């Protein structure tokens, strides 16, 4: 069931997709996902169904009814699907695949054919739609950033540092900056398009944030565009500010004993409509809910029996 202004779900290696609500940490519905692991899941903008992508298939699960099975499944690719997402009105779904391709899909059962393919010589790691639903940033395993505009058929290629694979990228909803992280912790921040008129897509590198000695797994802005959270393989999640790009807050799941030896990474994170409470998905077979100010955890959901590598948290527009 998903009849609620706010919903959140996690997925991992235990072959289940857990749904719950931040009231007491109790699960409502556990959807059966089997024969593969979930790379990433995303909710439809109309809040009717979820879509989880893993290893050559994208499986959609109804939120209104009580169905544990993948009502709609997409096939055709040959490798993993790193990330998925839909148009702001639910018109086309952009799927970046592991092998070499970032493609679009048509969600209508008709011969519309608005689907295209973008092919690069490196495995894709992340795709990020532009806030105006026109451009799309691709980040692959060769440190190259392909800003590809759906208007034209040409894409620019930018390499901050070669021989290192970038892992994620995101653009704040207010279109103020554009950040990305790679497999060594560096976080480059180029200034995104300022020419809203005819999509000039000018890029100037503002600054680089040296942090995350270990691998950096994901970086995400805030819907208020005042914060930027990034998670690393050192069991830390650092939230930085957008004014001077300093270290605003740092959270960690380290117990402080040498007996655990990196018992779990911080795979994913997400903000709230108020930009005050964030949710993090660790590899400790559970997810946590923290506040951006008090630092300490606010809640914990521990219904999983394996690692947790992806989570979705959607809330009302008010916040």
């Amino acid at each position: 069931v998903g009849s609620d202004p706010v919903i959140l779900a996690t997925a991992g290696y235990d072959h289940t997709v857990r749904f719950w609500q931040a009231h007491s940490g109790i699960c409502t519905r556990t959807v059966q996902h089997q024969d593969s692991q979930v790379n990433a899941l995303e909710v439809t903008p109309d809040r009717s169904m979820i879509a989880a992508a893993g290893y050559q298939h994208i499986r959609m699960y109804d939120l209104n009814s009580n169905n544990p099975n993948p009502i709609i499944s997409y096939d055709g690719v040959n490798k993993n699907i790193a990330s998925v997402g839909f148009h702001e009105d639910g018109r086309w779904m952009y799927t970046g695949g592991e092998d070499c391709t970032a493609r679009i899909w048509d969600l209508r059962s008709r011969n519309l054919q608005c689907q295209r393919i973008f092919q690069v010589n490196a495995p894709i790691n992340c795709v990020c739609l532009h806030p105006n639903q026109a451009e799309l940033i691709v980040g692959d395993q060769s440190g190259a950033i392909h800003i590809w505009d759906l208007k034209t058929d040409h894409n620019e290629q930018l390499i901050p540092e070669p021989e290192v694979s970038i892992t994620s990228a995101h653009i704040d909803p207010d279109a103020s900056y554009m950040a990305a992280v790679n497999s060594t912790g560096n976080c480059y921040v180029w200034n995104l398009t300022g020419g809203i008129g005819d999509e000039v897509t000018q890029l100037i590198p503002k600054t680089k944030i040296p942090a995350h000695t270990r691998y950096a797994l994901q970086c995400r802005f805030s819907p208020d565009s005042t914060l930027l959270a990034t998670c690393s393989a050192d069991q830390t999640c650092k939230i930085w500010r957008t004014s001077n790009f300093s270290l605003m807050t740092e959270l960690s799941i380290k117990s402080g004993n040498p007996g655990e030896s990196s018992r779990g990474w911080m795979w994913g994170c997400a903000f709230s409509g108020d930009s005050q409470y964030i949710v993090t998905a660790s590899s400790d077979n559970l997810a946590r809910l923290w506040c951006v100010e008090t630092g300490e955890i606010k809640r914990e959901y521990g219904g999983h029996q394996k690692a947790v590598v992806c989570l979705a948290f959607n809330d009302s527009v008010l916040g």
Binding site: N69, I72, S73, D75
Partner: peptide
């Protein structure tokens, strides 16, 4: 008859089998 048993199993399974759309 073994083919009758196989037909019964396939009949019962097929009804449960098709419930989803594959694109």
């Amino acid at each position: 008859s073994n083919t009758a048993q196989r037909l019964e199993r396939l009949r019962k399974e097929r009804q449960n089998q098709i419930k989803c759309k594959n694109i």
